[PDB]
């Protein structure tokens, strides 16, 4: 239309940024919880047909051996951010022989957001914001850490953050059930409980993804047996 | 225009005089006719002749406001003329496009839409005359709207001779006029 991508509303809102933020509410619900025992990431696969293979719906991604990411919204848009996170990481290791801070990874991914434009831009520059919301979860010198990133490039550490279609109700439930000193098993169970009450379908070990980043241990995607072990309770 | 006379006859004379032919054929009687050709080729002449010979009332719809008081005090829709046409059935509604969008073709679209399946009284035919057929709206060129399109090409040498014979018959002519030579002297002429 007449408006450019880099246009400000009379209220001071970047139009395309707000419109990309509205894209997350159509995405699947993801829930990240940070606890002293580790970071738990959960997401709903939202299977639309029995023929579709659930294993191909990858919405929790290994960023590095100590960092994972859960994406919500336009999953295709999240591929570029994931690739930049996984390339920017191992570049810090290449030059400094150390793993990045989760905050540094989230900041590097955030710098990609808002790097879009129409005129006076590079040929490889993007045309629109990334219509995806990311939940980075990892372990670093500061222990376990969970960061939330949105298409405006605003990344912020969160104790327990829910994004996606059910972000409002899941966030309310997280506020109701989160306390700072709780185990990782309790975090996983609470996240699964919150997911189960917001899914359109019925929760099972196939339509959800669960991952954990614990101190000492590496990023771990939960298998079907491990998922069934915790689902059998609730 | 013998071919044009036969073509317009099979579509306007037969449905009025012999609806049983179309009923036996199992086809819908034609309701809309298009006559396309250069101006002065006899489209209005043939329309008036076919209205005269079949005893069908000839109504010319020019869209002029001067005659609106006769059509109706409302004048909000052109279909208000139908009340008059039904009172003089069989009727032939004629509109000539002199050539925004064309009002004559819009009136065609409205009248044809009414005549499609929403008109109770039969024997109400509708004729257009237009200079060109490639300018017509896609709605009018859609199959099923105009049941027959008849071309009125400019007369050739023999047709020009026939028109010359018809029109010079109204004059005190000396014997021995070589009307054939005069017809040859008018290449690309209209009636």
């Amino acid at each position: 239309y007449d408006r450019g991508v880099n246009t400000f509303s009379p209220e001071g809102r970047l139009f395309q940024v707000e419109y990309a933020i509205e894209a997350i509410k159509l995405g699947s619900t993801a829930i990240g919880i940070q606890t002293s025992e580790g970071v738990c990431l959960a997401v709903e696969k939202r299977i639309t047909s029995p023929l579709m293979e659930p294993s191909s719906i990858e919405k929790i991604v290994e960023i590095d051996a100590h960092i994972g990411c859960a994406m919500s919204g336009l999953i295709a848009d999240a591929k570029t951010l994931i690739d930049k996170a996984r390339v920017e990481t191992q570049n810090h290791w290449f030059t400094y022989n150390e793993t990045m801070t989760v905050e540094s990874v989230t900041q590097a991914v955030s710098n990609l957001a808002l790097q879009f434009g129409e005129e006076d831009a590079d040929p490889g520059a993007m045309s629109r914001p990334f219509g995806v919301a990311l939940l980075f979860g990892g372990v670093d010198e500061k222990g376990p850490q969970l960061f939330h990133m949105d298409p405006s490039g605003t990344f912020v550490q969160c104790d327990a953050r829910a994004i996606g279609s059910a972000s409002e109700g899941a966030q309310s439930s997280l506020q109701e059930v989160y306390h700072k000193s709780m185990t990782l098993k309790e975090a996983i169970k609470s996240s699964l409980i919150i997911l189960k009450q917001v899914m359109e379908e019925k929760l099972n070990a196939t339509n959800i993804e669960l991952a954990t980043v614990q101190p000492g241990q590496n990023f771990h995607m939960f298998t079907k047996e491990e998922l069934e072990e915790v689902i059998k309770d609730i | 225009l013998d071919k044009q006379i036969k073509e317009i006859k099979e579509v306007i004379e037969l449905p009025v005089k012999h609806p049983e032919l179309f009923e036996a054929l199992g086809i819908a009687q034609p309701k809309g006719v298009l006559l396309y050709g250069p101006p002065g080729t006899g489209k209005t002449l043939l329309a008036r002749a076919v209205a005269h010979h079949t005893d069908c009332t000839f109504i010319r719809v020019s869209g002029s406001e001067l005659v609106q008081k006769f059509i109706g005090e409302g004048a909000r829709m052109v279909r208000e003329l139908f009340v008059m046409a039904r009172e003089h059935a069989p009727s032939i509604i004629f509109m000539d496009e002199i050539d925004g969008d064309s009002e004559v073709q819009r009136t065609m679209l409205e009248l044809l839409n009414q005549l499609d399946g929403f008109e109770a009284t039969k024997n109400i035919k509708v004729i257009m005359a237009t200079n060109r057929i490639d300018i017509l709206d896609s709605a009018l060129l859609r199959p099923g709207r105009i049941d027959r399109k008849i071309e009125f090409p400019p007369p050739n040498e023999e047709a020009r001779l026939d028109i010359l014979k018809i029109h010079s018959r109204k004059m005190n002519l000396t014997r021995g006029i070589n009307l054939r030579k005069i017809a040859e002297l008018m290449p690309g002429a209209s009636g």
Partner: protein, 395 residues
């Protein structure tokens, strides 16, 4: 079947009896506007025809020698004539003013009765006489919007004593704006249902007239007849029909409509006080409105009917599925989550289409699957024709 013969006998007797009754009493004609004979006061009609003389309507023009005991009144009897007359003995001299319509006799044309000002019948019909069947309980997700609207258009009329005591002048204008189907006209209908003062509904397209200056005349007469009431509300639905911003495009582009809008603006806030009229306008294109019309003192409150949030959508789903024969475990919160940016009209259509899916399957109860298919058909399948994405740039 054993009673059928007696049924028909007594039915025919009843029909004959009804015809016989109508023979003596009346009930006939009805094409010449004749009332039933039970209301015929014929003696009083004759006494009125004799005693009560007809009065021609004229307009007083000038009062000569009003101070003295012989004031002469120049009246303009419509298309008839112009006369210099005097008041009848039964009319006080102070009851007739210059420029007001009067009624005079046909013999000496002496002024016999002051008359109400002439109002166009089209303007008169614009006032609402049957209140709509919508209450504020039928609008969901608009708690703040409804409160702001009520404290301007309803509270000052209901309890004016709370405002005069504190020297408070309440706002006298509200503009409801938002994407189509968000509930602007629904809230206006709720206001008209709850209001007790005179409510006038004006559609902007009704203010477009064939002739020059006629729309401004209708606006003037609308505010004249609105001022003949102690408290009044005027609703301007789709004010963008005539409320567009003034522009000069070389030719006379929208000059007459701009004059109508200027007349409306002058009535709202001009040299003369507006009165106790509290106006109300609803439009889905508030960006096109003139800056002078969008100014406080003409449109003091600007209530935005944005698309409902999750709680608002759940509330609308509860409102529209209240009388539904739904199942026991319908997850209306999930349904509201499944349509992020949807108007209340889309939610109503979702409820109706879920009911239609249940009906088509010859089922008396609509399950949750029916609501899911309704969401797919309305929110998703019909999303090509959605007016939402285009119209939130305008709001």
């Amino acid at each position: 079947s054993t009673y059928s013969r007696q049924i028909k006998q007594v039915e025919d007797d009843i029909q004959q009896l009804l015809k016989k009754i109508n023979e003596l009493t009346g009930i006939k004609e009805s094409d010449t506007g004749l009332a039933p004979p039970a209301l015929w006061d014929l003696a009083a009609d004759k006494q009125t025809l004799q005693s009560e003389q007809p009065l021609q309507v004229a307009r007083c023009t000038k009062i000569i020698n009003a101070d003295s005991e012989d004031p002469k009144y120049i009246i303009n009897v419509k298309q008839f004539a112009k006369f210099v007359v005097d008041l009848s003995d039964q009319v006080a001299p102070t009851d007739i003013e210059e420029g007001m319509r009067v009624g005079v006799d046909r013999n000496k044309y002496q002024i016999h009765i002051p008359l109400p000002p002439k109002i166009d019948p089209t303007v008169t019909m614009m006032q609402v006489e049957e209140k709509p069947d919508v209450t504020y309980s039928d609008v969901g997700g608009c708690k703040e919007q409804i409160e702001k609207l009520r404290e301007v258009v309803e509270t000052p009329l209901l309890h004016p004593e709370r405002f005069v005591n504190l020297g408070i002048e309440p706002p006298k204008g509200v503009l409801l704006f938002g994407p189509p189907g968000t509930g602007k006209t629904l809230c206006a209908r709720a206001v008209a249902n709850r209001t007790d003062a005179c409510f006038i509904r004006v559609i902007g397209s009704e203010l477009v007239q064939k002739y020059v200056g006629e729309g401004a005349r209708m606006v003037r007469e609308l505010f004249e007849m609105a001022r003949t009431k102690k408290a009044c509300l005027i609703f301007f639905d789709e004010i963008d029909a005539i409320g567009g911003a003034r522009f000069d495009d070389g030719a006379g582009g929208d000059n007459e409509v701009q004059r109508t809008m200027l007349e409306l603006i002058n009535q709202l806030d001009g040299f003369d006080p507006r009165g106790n009229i509290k106006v109300l306008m609803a439009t889905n294109r508030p960006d096109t409105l003139d800056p002078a019309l969008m100014r406080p003192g003409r449109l003091d409150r600007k209530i935005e009917f944005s698309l409902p949030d999750l709680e608002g959508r759940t509330h609308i789903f509860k409102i529209h599925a209240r009388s539904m024969s739904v199942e026991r475990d319908i997850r209306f919160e999930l349904l509201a989550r499944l349509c992020p940016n949807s108007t209340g009209a889309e939610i109503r259509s979702v409820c109706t289409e879920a009911g239609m899916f249940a009906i088509r399957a010859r089922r008396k109860i609509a399950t949750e699957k029916d609501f899911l298919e309704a969401v797919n058909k309305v929110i998703k399948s019909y999303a090509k024709f959605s007016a939402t994405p285009r119209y939130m740039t305008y709001n």
